């Protein structure tokens, strides 16, 4: 078993009133950049966003499970849109259970997943889970290349817990958008087009589609000639 | 199916996977290339120069292994400099022959897909392509690199002989634009080198321009 | 069939106030079988000391080789080789066999006779120099030795106190390694006197 | 590991080391390798630690159920066969166990059964099991007689483990002694090799290979 | 699987070596002498890969005999052992190494002391009071740890050796067809015919 | 081909006193050469004055702790709210681990608490269930660095009484909670210096008859 | 040729190179690893090829030191032969042709930087013999953490002080986020018309805190069997 | 490369390496395909029909394994016939879902790259592509098969939305012509199927025509 | 490996079986009886994979004893051998086959004739005047081709057997610690204590 059509990095971070999460709109087929209209951020209710990387067929399977979870929660539940609504912590633990069960049957869902959201009591939720069933939480979280390149940049803003209240939504979103640009420079299986989602405890869920990487530095390339000695 | 070319590369070495092409036209010949260099899925260099000078008006496009193509191009440049000191300016055919000799005789230890392009006054613009095997093929235009697969259809339909400079630049720009769009191993800026009687001209084109073609 | 862990053994070196210490175990085995409990791994050429862990045949071969090279050095230079120079000689000699290396983990220790400065150094099998103020470790219980040294070590220890620290580091590391132990030797090296002590340790 | 047990005039001597390894890493020096199944039955452990420990405590449960059902203590033969039939069901699955079921009953007398994870079950007077079994055999065989005293037999068992503890890299820690009579098993103490080696070297005058 | 033992006592060195030569499922010979005299007071026993053992032993023997003629002088056991070790140390990094393990028992006439050296095919030399190669050591070392004393006589050493052979005959899987025993002392080398 | 195991690094440490017991563990979580989290706890209060940690492959570690916590819950339901003794918990964990003998939990488990005489207890487990009570145990990535230090400082190994010719050993004695925490903090700072997978933060859980207390300390973040 | 040694030291690292107004600066961390174990907590990864050409090295530690010294030796002889100060392209050409000849078996990954009569230069060399030109470059296990910082903050026309800040910030990103890198930050500045200044331990943000206890043993704690005076004299 | 698509096949099985595409347009949708089937380098069938009916106005293009795609298409046709008996005419989305379910749940044992195309009266022309993984992707047009690699550049540059019937037929003809020219696994005749409100129309085009485009 | 032999003579069947049980480089036991009595006039010797041998032998023994009780009648050696063969023939195509080779020596009371059957782990049955399993056959078959006669007595058969054991002790690589000999005849089964 292996992933065929794949999605690359998913990045995310916490800020004073909520969480931000982002992911590009590419479905790679090996080295071929085959599909360009792939949404890899999937909202669940008006308080959670699940970002998924890895195998896209397995992503679409998870989509259907989450869709079905909202339906099932509504059954015989008069408080489905109030006290007994789906929380980010519920949605995550469900997925984490599935991922670990599948790895334990030697038949894993190939993915790396980040569940971002805001709880009912206003607390920020951000936690990671992957094909192995491994889970962890941190002020910043990222998958694939994001882990190597985005996290370093995002940790300069929020290095520890105490930096979260000091970080505004403007500063946080700027860091995310910057990180997406760096990934476009340096990740061979990434695209310019991406989606971004903000879940705030006050202003709620804001889903931004069709964003582009901009303000790129390419001008210095013209001065670079040859690979050593060549002058022309 | 061309994963096999990448398969030939030594473990962990830098890969040139590329979108390179050379096109003859009325006034001479134009070489074109992307600027991406990869180590797996990490882009080691996003502003590479794959168009390299082996003589005043004989250049080449490099693809395959970065190390192998550089080592070869350096040796060829040495041979042609020594040729010039004894026998005067070498023909583009002569340059392609020296490339072939190195690529063919070391075909097992090398991964180098090279396009040779030059301008004589007698022979005008000429293009020779040298694939992995070490064979030589003289053509009106040539395409190569991992990204070239995606533009065989486009280039065959759109290429005409005796094009103008502006038409040839548009042909190369549109072609490499598509190759870059579809090939993950290709990207960055589009470098070009114009070879005519007038001299040598370097051109560059940035993403903001060519992406929205 | 891993050359570095057929025979087993350990070496450790430390610095102190105007002194250095170098210590080693005495075991030579063939995997599980203990064969000899008298196999010393520390040698000396003039005032420069060399400890060597790893494949025993190479330990012996390198000792004979550096005895050879330091003797010719002395005849031509008309002086004893210094630790800094000897360290470079070991590095050169190991890298000369880059693609057919001696399977060893050598450790240099000594005091420079001109400047009086305590000196220690370690190498990998192909001659990469590892210089250190504090301590150098080598052998099948290197992880254990790293742990003991990092916690027990403090700078500027007197020769008598330094002896206790290095001895406790070696003993407790050796007892957590199956292929190391069976006795131990500690060298305490001052500017112009050198004491050699055999430690009592558990013989299993 | 190194474990042994031998039969003699005055019953059965059982002796084991206490080391546990994970490759060349010495993980523990204080492992109990003798399991006390009941006042008349002992079991030794060698090989995979978990396999031995788990299945021999399980064996003790099966022996208890026997005496509840049959109103009588289980025979050494029957106890050993429960274990040998169990591991045989797991043959090929990768269990690693080298055990000895030692004990006394009226009908059998003092009896020792070697039982290993590839299904072998053997009755016998002398057995040494483990990575250092050969070292123990060398000392034990060359000094063994049926007419040994309880004092001499206890010492020979202790000395045979010590011999193996010394030479075998994967044996050591301390020696646990047991003596099995018609009245049941009797524990004869934990003996650390740290002190025991030097005590034995001085008093016996042996171990001349070592720097005294 | 080939048994070679060695015991150094007060005034002599005793080497015991198995007589069996086995190929496949057949014992081709049961009276083989796995040793060569290197010099009047130096004896080397050997065991390992077929062919290599005798080829190596005789090659060393020739070299030591050449030295003796040239200098009209016998090399010390320490000197011979160092020469042998170096040859094996060269060998291990050759195109095809000698897969031979040896024991060198000798009597140094200048020191008036017996000496026993154990060298494996890698070139790993150790001086010992008692030594063994192959699976034999797994039994004999612990046995000798117990029974050996440094001040023993040659007769006491032979009884100590009998104790080893008995144990090996009891617990070894293969029939090695007994041993040839040889004694090295101040009066040279001699063979014990009845063992 | 799919590999179901992974290494999440980290290291843990249990020490037992006279009337108390500590179970410490760093808060760093890693994969390969990357840091996943600087604060991800892996030492848990499981109820009945039992603290537990299962270091190694975090997914298997979490699954095991989760299952033991649940085992404690069902022990109360089935046996009239009886307190689960540390020795009983240890045996129960053996069966959890050995249950997956042929597809193991890749973890080194340590539990700590008080025995039925009120005295400090530490139990340690291998991946397939073999267990042993000890005064002292380090587990995880830096276990090989810390463990011999503990042999020397807790159990006074290789230490003899000065002037007694190496005849009389240094006498064994229980350590105070203050002295034990000193050894833990020094063990982890040393392990942080020399092991790349160890750092960020240290979380100690102390267990006395009064309950379970926590203490946190910063560690180097490189 | 031997297909790798696992025992051979191969340190994790973060080395970078940044070009500025009147020259070039390189920097590095100071951790040397053995597997997961930190062997040296303050090694020097910045090497001297010639007075004004310096070389940062990652990969197989023995190969980077050995190859930098060999080329440095030949560069010195070349400089004496030609009566000229050595050029960076000469070191570049000699390094790549050596590394290429061995087909990657010499695992040296280098950032070369320096000044010479031609000007200021910055190159990178990979083990297989390929070379790259750039204004900013990073290698080592923490290259991605460093390059993320370089891509975020680098601009054209940097000053000396800005380049040192950018370089050390890139190394810090490796120190904190990459497990292969750590400890201190070394820097070497090579400006045109001036001597190159080597700033050993330019930053030391990872100082070991005071230990809770002293582990100085009472004298006589260790049991001894034999003492003897060793003869070092003739 | 294309190899790991063909490296999936079982030893010796018939290969459906292909040049298949489906294109939506003003009046509905058009499916297109070549006719070549190979066993290694031998052409087992030069006149194959890769365009297959699963319902009146829901068709699919097959690529990958001949056996696997046939077995799947037969099952889908069975499901949609049973669907029609109970719930009436199924949507094109419904058909794609049934294809996905079979491809995804049996992703390890199958090699089937299927394009689904259909015509509703409400939804007009629709195209869903289902690659090897078993994922679903709704698109304006889709290309697939070994020969599609060579026409990514051409198709992206030349495709427009709301084309006429004659324009779409020319677009498919020119595209597959190039795919066939460059891909050895593709060839023979170019079959097409037109899906509109008018009904179902079959078209065929022979080498003598399309080769010299 | 293990040695199991069988010789059918005029009025009896003689089975010889090695006493050694070896694991690794250690002979764990030197008095092992590699046989089980299936019925008063039927004896089965066995050799092969550790554990499997005894588990198989006892399983057969139980089944034959169950038949004897049920029918109050002893099964003929031919009938027992056919039952054993079928069990091995089933076994070889199981998930984990019994790797056991056996010799079945019996005295048929109805025919008043001795019978010897050789069955391998595949379920390959043959009735023979003399038989052997493992490497033993490579020596004993040619020896018996020469010395065996069909009309020999039990005493002549024992001398013929001694000749086999001597040859094996001379030319076999492994020490198999002698043999336990048992005789099957009209009066049942008995063991020769001094061999
Ligand atoms: C002598 C000492 C050696 O043979 C004895 O035989 C003892 C027997 C006593 C303990 C009963 N044997 C061992 O100590 C035994 C050796 C061994 C190891 C593995 C397989 C067979 C034999 N040691 C163990 O079993 C250790 C005991 C631990 C240290 C308490 N356990 C392990 O090595 C475990 C589990 C092994 C295992 C078996 C089957 C399936 C899965 C796992 N492995 C680890 O702990 C892995 N790892 C090693 C490095 O440290 C981190 C954990
Ligand atoms: Cl390049
Ligand atoms: Cl078909
Ligand atoms: Mg031992
Ligand atoms: Mg064709």
Author numbering:
A (entry chain M): 2 to 233
B (entry chain b), H (entry chain N): -16 to 196
C (entry chain W): 1 to 204
D (entry chain K): 1 to 212
E (entry chain X), I (entry chain J): 1 to 195
F (entry chain L): 1 to 222
G (entry chain V): -11 to 222
Question: Can you list sentences taken from the study reporting this PDB entry?
Answer:
The 20S proteasome core particle (CP) is the key non-lysosomal protease of eukaryotic cells. Its seven different α and seven different β subunits assemble into four heptameric rings that are stacked on each other to form a hollow cylinder. Only three out of the seven different β subunits, namely β1, β2 and β5, bear N-terminal proteolytic active centres, and before CP maturation these are protected by propeptides. In the last stage of CP biogenesis, the prosegments are autocatalytically removed through nucleophilic attack by the active site residue Thr1 on the preceding peptide bond involving Gly(-1)45.
Yeast strains carrying the single mutations β1-T1A or β2-T1A, or both, are viable, even though one or two of the three distinct catalytic β subunits are disabled and carry remnants of their N-terminal propeptides. These results indicate that the β1 and β2 proteolytic activities are not essential for cell survival. In subunit β1, we found that Gly(-1) indeed forms a sharp turn, which relaxes on prosegment cleavage. Regarding the β2 propeptide, Thr(-2) occupies the S1 pocket but is less deeply anchored compared with Leu(-2) in β1, which might be due to the rather large β2-S1 pocket created by Gly45. Thr(-2) positions Gly(-1)O via hydrogen bonding (∼2.8 Å) in a perfect trajectory for the nucleophilic attack by Thr1Oγ.
